[PDB]
Each structure stands twice: as structure tokens, then as C-alpha cells.
């Protein structure tokens with residue numbers, strides 16, 4: 137394997153972390169390959185669930201707890217902290233909230249959250265690498281509570297970063313928020329990618345094609361697919377009661393990704409940096425409710 141930049145995995149990984157049996161588990165938690173039979177039963181349907189009153193409450197709850205966990209991880213981002221240490225804090229914070237960390241054993245994903253540094257696009261595996269001054273690091277949190285998943289992420293700065301990092305991160309965050317601003321009943325899912333690419337391109341950046349936002353609720357990933365690039369052929373039209381993520385990954389260089397020999401870590405083929413933000417949204421009559429927003433602060437963590 138020829139690495140595409142300077143990042144390397146730092147092994148060994150700590151043994152899988154157990155989750156106490158009192159915490160309610162998703163179906164894939166105990167499947168030996170991490171397969172979700174409730175997602176597989178739905179494999180090739182385009183049908184989007186219309187959430188009940190009760191579903192919305194379950195989503196509001198899990199997404200708020202998820203935000204709380206992401207904020208814990210935010211507090212830990214500094215030079216010399218390892219991504220495994222961040223993941224341990226996350227795993228304990230989920231447990232404190234009587235939540236299962238949804239990534240844990242999801243298709244045999246080995247950790248409780250994803251930590252993506254610099255050229256990693258997404259799905260990096262927490263490991264022994266200490267964060268370095270100048271890094272940009274994304275923490276991607278997903279929680280499972282009472283049958284519902286809530287999924288969000290942010291990119292953070294590790295100490296002082298260069299100007300390119302500041303611009304990449306800022307534009308990525310703008311991309312997500314312009315897409316969120318367009319959400320409202322009657323809009324097609326395929327439109328969001330147009331908005332995203334239009335803004336990333338205006339700032340000299342590209343859009344990852346190989347990973348999409350997605351419906352989420354009782355399933356971790358389900359219809360609609362939500363591509364982030366222009367002229368995609370995504371199916372479906374937003375209606376009040378739809379819940380899904382938007383989670384654009386934007387890159388300094390070209391859009392092409394490849395995966396590490398670990399089968400998870402996705403990286404730019406050119407080794408240039410990539411940044412991401414994600415929220416879980418519910419479509420309402422006036423537009424949308426950002427279920428994973430901050431409640432107590434105006435801005436994402438990187439702005440402060």
C-alpha cells in the first residue's frame with residue numbers, strides 16, 4: 137500500500153470496548169459481521185418514511201444527546217491528545233447518556249466514533265496517533281437511544297492552523313448551511329448537491345462523490361440517498377416529517393477517494409486535505425429543524 141500523504145495508522149488498537157448490557161442495542165450490535173437485518177430488509181427501496189409524532193420526539197432526543205457527545209469530543213481537541221483517547225471519552229459519554237455508540241460494530245467498525253485527520257475524507261479509525269499542531273480533525277458522532285439514531289459531525293482545528301485549513305473548513309461549513317437553508321417541503325433531494333458544488337467550486341475546492349448523506353431514524357442509513365455533488369440523479373422530494381443527514385466532504389485538490397487496507401479509512405488520492413460537517417435535519421412546514429444544532433452557542437466549534 138502506497139499512502140497518499142503523511143498520515144499513517146498507529147497500531148495496535150485497544151481491544152473492543154464493551155457497552156453495559158442495560159443499554160439498548162441496535163440489531164447489528166450482536167451480528168458477527170455487523171450486518172443490520174432491518175436495513176437489509178429495506179435494501180433497494182426508495183420509499184421515505186413519514187415520521188410519527190412519537191418518532192420525531194425520539195429523534196429530537198437522540199440528536200440532542202448526540203450533540204452533547206460531539207461537544208465533549210470538541211473540548212478535548214488539542215496537541216498531543218490521541219484519537220483513541222477522544223474515542224474512549226465518547227464511548228463513556230454515550231454510556232452516561234444510556235445510549236449505544238451506533239458506529240461500534242456497524243459492519244464491524246471497531247470504534248465508537250470516526251476521527252478523520254487532514255487527508256482523511258471520512259471513517260478514520262481512532263488510534264494511537266497524537267494530534268499535531270496544524271492538523272484539522274473531524275469527529276463524527278452517532279448515538280442510538282430507544283430505537284433512534286442521531287448523527288452529526290464537525291471539523292476542528294488543532295491549535296493554530298494555516299490559511300488554507302481555515303478556508304477549507306469555513307467553506308465546507310458554508311456548503312452544509314447553504315444546503316440546509318434550501319430544505320423545505322417540495323424541494324428535490326437531488327438539488328442539494330447543486331448548491332453544495334456551486335459554493336465549493338467558487339472557492340477552488342471539490343466535492344467527494346463516493347459517500348452520501350442519508351435518511352436516518354430507526355435505521356442508521358436508509359432512504360433517501362443524498363449526494364453532495366452537482367447533477368446527481370438522487371430520487372425523491374422533501375416533505376414535512378422526512379429526516380435525513382446532509383454531510384458534505386470537500387477537498388483542497390481533486391475529488392477522488394481511495395480506502396486504506398483497514399477497509400474503512402477513506403483518503404484523498406492526491407493527499408490534499410478534506411473537511412466535513414454533518415447535521416440530522418427534520419423537514420417541517422417552514423423549512424427544517426436542525427435536530428443536531430447547538431442549543432447554547434451561535435457558532436460551530438472551529439469559529440471560537
Ligand SMILES: CO[C@@H](C(=O)NC[C@@H]1CCCN(C(=O)C2CC2)C1)[C@H](O)[C@@H](O)[C@H](O)/C=C/C(C)(C)C
Pocket residue numbers: 175238239240242245250258259276277278287288347348349350357358383414
Ligand atoms: C460519510 O459517512 C457517511 C456514509 O458513509 N454515508 C453513506 C452510507 C454509509 C453506510 C453504507 N450506506 C448505505 O446507505 C447502506 C444502507 C447501508 C451508505 C456516514 O453516514 C457517517 O455520517 C457515519 O457517521 C459513519 C458511519 C460508519 C459507522 C459507517 C463509519
Ligand SMILES: [Mn+2]
Pocket residue numbers: 276277278287288289383414
Ligand atoms: Mn456521521
Ligand SMILES: [Mn+2]
Pocket residue numbers: 287349350381383414
Ligand atoms: Mn451520516
Ligand code: NA
Pocket residue numbers: 252253254255256257258272274409410411
Ligand atoms: Na480530513
